[PDB]
RNA sequence: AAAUUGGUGUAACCUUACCGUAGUAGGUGCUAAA
RNA sequence: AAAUUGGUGUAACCUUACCGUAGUAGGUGCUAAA
RNA sequence: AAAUUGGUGUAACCUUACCGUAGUAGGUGCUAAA
C-alpha cells in the first residue's frame, strides 16, 4: 500500500528502448533514474513509473503526477505515460537511509518524495489504470486514445519484451 | 442539485401581493429582484426564494440564509420567509454570462452568489422545508409557529393564487 | 457523553492512599483536586481521573491526556495512571458557573478545560480501557504491563476498598 | 532526455486538482445589489 | 421595501452556524491550577 | 505531590498524536534531481 522506489538496470532499459523509443534514458552517471512501483501487478507484470526532475514542462494531468514538498516546491513528476514492465532481477530497491548516508542532499529529496507519494498513491494507481486501459484498447481509437497512444510507451510491446526476457 | 437564479414578472408579483402584502417589491427599475429556485417542487408548485441586499438587518436564522464571498463580505440574504410559488411562464432564467456582458460588476456579483450557493444549497433546502411545514400546520400554533406565521408569506393563499393563474 | 468534573472528599482519598500510595494528594487548601468522570462504569465502579497542573513533566502518552487551550497553552494533564474508583457519596459535582462566580480566573480555566475535554473524551475513554485492561491482567506481565503496573495505582485493591466502604 | 491532444465549474486570469458517473485547493481580479 | 419572536453549548462578549434527535466556525476577553 | 519503561513512520531534530490491526498535526532543518 506504500510506494517503493527502484532503480532499473541500464541493460534492461536499453533492451526495452529497442522496441519503443519512448522508454526513458536512464542517465546512470550519478543518480540512476528512480521509478515508483505500481502497487498491483498488471496482467502478471510488475510495472514501474519513472520520475523526472523536469518540473516545469507542459504535462497533461491524465498521464502525470506532480510531487510537491511541504513548502510547495516542485520535487519531481511521475510520468505514467512512460511506465514500463520490469522483471524482478533487473530492478533494485532503493534504501533511502543508505542513499542519505552516501549523498545527504539527494537522499533527503528522496525522503520528501516518499512522504508526498504515500499520501497520493491512490491518484497514481487511479491514473495508471485509466491510461493502461485506454492505450491497450482496440480497435478504433477515440480522440483521447489517439492522444494517449501517441504520448505513451507501447505497453503491449514492452510486455512481450518482458516475456522474452523470461528465458532465464 | 445546483441552484438556478430567476427574475419574476412584475405582473405576477403584483398579482400575488394582492393576496399577501409580504410579497417582495420587485424593483425592476435597473435590476429586477433575483430569486433562487427551490430544488424540488412543493405540493406541485415551483417555489422561488427572493434575494435582498439589505445585508445588515436583524435576520432570524430560521428564515434566512446569509451569503458571503471569499473575502467574507456580505453578498445578499435569501429570505425564505418571503418564498413564493410561481408558474413557469411568469419567470425567466438568469444567464450570468449574459448579465456579466451587459453589466460587468453586477454579473460578477451574481457569479459570487452562485458559487456560494452551490456549496450551501443543503441549508436552503433544509430551512425551506422546516418553515413551510410550520407555517402550514394547523390548527393551534406553538410559540414558534406564531412567530413564523407572522413573519412569512401566507404560503397556502399564494398557492391558490398560483392555481387561479392556471386558467391559461 | 460529555465529561463532568468532580472533587473527591479528602477522607475517602486518605482512606484509599492507605491501600495504595500512588493515590493523588488532594491538596484541598484552596482548590481541591478536580477529577473527570469516566463515561461508563468499570466492573460496577464509578471511576474518576485526576487532573494535575504539572504540565511540563515527562508523561508517557499511554497513561495521560494533555489538555490545551485555544492559544495552545498547556492547561492540565489527566493522569489515567492515577484513576480511582469512588462511591457517589464521596464525590461532589463541580458547577463551573458557581466556581466562576467565587473565583473568576479559576472557574474560567475550568471552562477552557471543559471545552477541550468535550472534544477529546474519546481519547480519555480509549486510554482508560487500555490501561485498566493491562494493569489487571494476569499472570505473567509483558514488558509493557510491568511498566504500567509500576506507574499505575493498584486498581483491584482500590476496588476492594470501594466495596468495603459500602458498609453504609 | 524529447513528445503532453482535447475536455470537465451558470468560473475572467495564474497555479493546483479532475477525465467523461470529469472542477478540488490556493492566489489574482471584481468589490457589485434587490 | 418593511416586519425577524423565542430557543439550543457546564459558553463572559461580537460575528458566524444551529432549531427542539437544536452550538459549527472565526475573533475578543480570561492567561488561571491540583 | 512524587514516579512515566519500551515501541509505532523507507522520518534528521523539537513539540504534538499514536500503542502493537501503533505516526496524526504544527515547527525546524535539508532546498536536493532523473
Descriptive overview:
Chains A, B, C: Its EC number is 3.1.-.-. Chains A, B, C: Belongs to the ToxN/AbiQ toxin family. Chains A, B, C: This is Endoribonuclease ToxN. The structure is a homotrimer of 168-residue chains. The radius of gyration of chain A is 16 Å and the shape is globular. The longest helix of chain A has 32 residues, at 104-135. Chain A has one domain (1-168): Roll (Thiol Ester Dehydrase, Chain A), CATH 3.10.129.130. Chain A has helices at 10-19, 96-102, 104-135, 143-151, 155-165, and strands at 5-8, 34-37, 47-52, 64-68, 74-79, 84-85, 91-93. Chain A has five helices and seven strands. Chain A is α+β, with helices and mostly antiparallel strands and 168 residues long. In chain A, strands 1, 2, 3, 4, 5, 6 and 7 form a seven-stranded antiparallel beta sheet that branches. Chain A is 41% helix and 18% strand. The two termini of chain A are 30 Å apart. In chain A, helix 2 crosses helix 3 (104-135). The chains hardly touch. The structure holds three RNA strands.
Name of the top-level CATH class of chain A: Alpha Beta
What order do the helices and strands of chain A follow?
EHEEEEEEHHHH
- How large is the count of helical segments of chain A? 5
CATH topology of chain A: Thiol Ester Dehydrase, Chain A
**Residues in helix, % of chain A:** 40-55%
* Class from helix and strand fractions of chain A: alpha+beta
Per the principal axes of the C-alpha atoms, what is the gross shape of chain A? Answer: globular
Q: Kindly state the number of beta strands of chain A.
A: 7
Tell me the major beta sheet of chain A.
Answer: 7 strands, antiparallel
Number of domains of chain A: 1
Q: For the CA atoms, what is the radius of gyration of chain A? A: 16 Å
Oligomer: homotrimer
- What is the level-2 CATH architecture name of chain A? Roll
Instruction: Tell me the strand percentage band of chain A.
Output: 15-25%
Distance between the termini of chain A: 30 Å
